[PDB]
Structure 1
Amino acid sequence: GASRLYTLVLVLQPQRVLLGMKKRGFGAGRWNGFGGKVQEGETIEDGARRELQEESGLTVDALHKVGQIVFEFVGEPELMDVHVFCTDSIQGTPVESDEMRPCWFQLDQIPFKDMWPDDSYWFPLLLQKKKFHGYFKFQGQDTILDYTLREVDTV
């Protein structure tokens, strides 16, 4: 099956994580990291930085690749190849964008019920400073039917 490149960025500080609420459309109200498609004409890391900046107004001094996840959807031939990054080196104050409303969450209050269902599986690994490869099969946007998570030394 064919695949397309995407990014996902977690701003993860010692005691808190930044998530953004999706403001627009039928998917509004879901809370998640920052990211989008990787464009022709930018690197994966360029795309991750661009989406972070566009969505939260933040720039970073460094991004660390912590995961790679393949998403498959029931009835959909195209796969998502998602490169997952973490940062604790943001260079300003999170601010609202057209698309996302950033908010800080304490690490004992991660809003899993209001996040993409896959986050419940891999975000715990990220908190343990583990790197991973993942695969998730979705029914629609709310349900996982199959998955695999593997700890790796190198992403």
Structure 2
Amino acid sequence: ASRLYTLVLVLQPQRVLLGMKKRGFGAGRWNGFGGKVQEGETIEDGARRELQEESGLTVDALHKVGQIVFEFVGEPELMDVHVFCTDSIQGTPVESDEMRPCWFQLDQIPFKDMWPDDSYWFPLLLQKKKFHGYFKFQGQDTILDYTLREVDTV
């Protein structure tokens, strides 16, 4: 089995919104907004909920742009992350207990201070190409295996 997660990227013509995760798993890396999908909500509802909780933002429409499956060695559940994009947003991004939001120019994405997988899949995100990814990690720093392909349906 796998555990459902959400990841949301606010991608505008000249900038992308990321949040510095301040506590919990992966703290100290810039990341999209998201987390675990709960019982009683759709995946898209969970994505909106996490975006709202972490940044204060609401959105008209989220678009499905990818799926990334993560294996962490020694962890029995695969993590099935559903990736979403939006261009337009409602509200001003504000800091939460979990996340400190900042806009980045598309040529200044801080990949060295992001999850290592992002280097591989972000360019597909920026090109508006839908994708399926798989990454096996040993801890939080080392990618042992991975696959990445473009898909017609996410």
1:127-138 equivalent positions in 2, closer than 5 A: 127-138=126-137
SS at 1:113 equivalent: helix
TM normalised by structure 1 equals 0.97
Aligned residues: 154
| Unaligned segments of structure 2, at least 5 residues | none
Partner deviation per Cα, 1:16-50 (whole Å, 9 max, x = no partner): 00000011257432100000000001100000000
**RMSD between aligned alpha carbons?**
1.0
Distance 2:34 2:106 in 1: 21
TM normalised by structure 2 equals 0.97
Distance 1:25 1:131, change over 3 A: closer
Distance 1:129 1:26, change over 3 A: closer
Partner deviation per Cα, 1:107-140 (whole Å, 9 max, x = no partner): 0000000000110100011111100011000010
Distance 2:22 2:3 in 1: 24
Distance 1:43 1:84 in 2: 14
Distance 1:154 1:78 in 2: 24
1:4-153 equivalent positions in 2, closer than 5 A: 4-25=3-24, 27-153=26-152
Distance 1:61 1:135, change over 3 A: same
Distance 2:79 2:25 in 1: 20
Which shifted more, 101-110 or 19-28?
Answer: 19-28
Distance 1:146 1:50, change over 3 A: same
Distance 1:73 1:25, change over 3 A: closer
Which shifted more, 43-52 or 71-80?
Answer: 71-80
Partner deviation per Cα, 1:81-125 (whole Å, 9 max, x = no partner): 110000001011100001100000000000000000110100011
Distance 2:91 2:66 in 1: 25
Partner deviation per Cα, 1:67-87 (whole Å, 9 max, x = no partner): 011000111211001100000
Distance 1:83 1:120, change over 3 A: same
